[PDB]
Design a protein around this ligand. Sequence first.
Ligand SMILES: Nc1ncnc2c1ncn2[C@@H]1O[C@H](COP(=O)(O)CP(=O)(O)OP(=O)(O)O)[C@@H](O)[C@H]1O
Ligand SMILES: Nc1ncnc2c1ncn2[C@@H]1O[C@H](COP(=O)(O)CP(=O)(O)OP(=O)(O)O)[C@@H](O)[C@H]1O
Ligand SMILES: [Mg+2]
Ligand SMILES: [Mg+2]
Ligand SMILES: [Mg+2]
Ligand SMILES: [Mg+2]
Length: 345
Amino acid sequence: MELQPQFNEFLANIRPTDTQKEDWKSGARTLRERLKNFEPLKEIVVSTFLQGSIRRSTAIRPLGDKRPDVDIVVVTNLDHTRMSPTDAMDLFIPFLEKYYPGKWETQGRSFGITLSYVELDLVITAIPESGAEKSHLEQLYKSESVLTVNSLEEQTDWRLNKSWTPNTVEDAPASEWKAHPLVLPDREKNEWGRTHPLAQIRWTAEKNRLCNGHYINLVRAVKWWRQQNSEDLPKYPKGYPLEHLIGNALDNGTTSMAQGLVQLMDTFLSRWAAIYNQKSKPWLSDHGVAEHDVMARLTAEDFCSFYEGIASAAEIARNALASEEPQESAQLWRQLFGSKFPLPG
Ligand SMILES: Nc1ncnc2c1ncn2[C@@H]1O[C@H](COP(=O)(O)CP(=O)(O)OP(=O)(O)O)[C@@H](O)[C@H]1O
Ligand SMILES: Nc1ncnc2c1ncn2[C@@H]1O[C@H](COP(=O)(O)CP(=O)(O)OP(=O)(O)O)[C@@H](O)[C@H]1O
Ligand SMILES: [Mg+2]
Ligand SMILES: [Mg+2]
Ligand SMILES: [Mg+2]
Ligand SMILES: [Mg+2]
């Protein structure tokens, strides 16, 4: 059985809490305003915006006491050919000491800021374009479409368009943004790399519409499966490479979460069968920066162990979907997801 009310309750159980949500919305607004009014950075900071799994509504609630990771981009107008990633980051130390003393730390390519209930993950970026192109991009980064702190789940009317306004317009033509990534610090060395968070967000919103609202829920459900079965799965993939694998495997047109789960798992297994039999791993283009392999740091051994995990899970998911009794079907789904998936009343 599909058990759509049970899937809805399960999703409500694995979303971050309202306490966490209001903490990160207020934290993002406060950081943005403080940066806006900080005199040494006023002419440098273009935009401060929410990104990552939190923005795309693909984050799951942390277990126990833990604070969710909440990703923030600071867009600057710095010349990345004349200043290194650390030059740009150096600019923000006085600001952090003034407004977040004792609550911030450098974490390699980003700054961690400990709030009451969440952990901000701040990345400093720059716009590589110049002239009029740069001005047009800065206008996009200053628009409500970028500055909204509501997540995709809260505004299905969201589009990547400097003219979009919250409903109390489509995505802009791709030629205005698709080939225009930001630069950010590389993970382990003082060099600029490319990232296109806006394009990832837009791609996710569109995939979610193409899949009738089930995509971001399916991402969170599969993350929860991976967490619940972590003892039997490889450490990687997780986080964004896992999300990207799910978005790849899922077909357009999803009609329920049970159907979508079985479909995406079946498709994963068929699409990567040759790669698995070659003891390899796929090369998968990032939706933001096409020439980037989202799987670049994943080992072939981990991909193949994960493939074995998906094969085992797909058998369970098929049985749960095919089951004609609500209790038996829910028991099989709970074999996948654990006790946060409820039994029907
Ligand atoms: N291998 C990768 N390829 C492309 N983009 C990536 C990426 N790793 C991270 N990113 C981008 O940077 C954002 C922040 O990354 P992370 O915080 O490390 C994982 P996340 O997607 O936010 O899930 P999580 O923090 O809830 O576990 C990601 O959401 C993604 O937009
Ligand atoms: N916090 C973040 N915010 C935005 N984009 C991020 C991000 N973390 C990672 N990304 C994106 O994911 C891509 C891959 O990032 P990582 O997995 O950390 C390897 P890297 O930084 O490219 O170093 P490497 O070339 O030495 O492997 C980055 O290029 C960036 O596009
Ligand atoms: Mg994150
Ligand atoms: Mg992070
Ligand atoms: Mg790299
Ligand atoms: Mg697909």
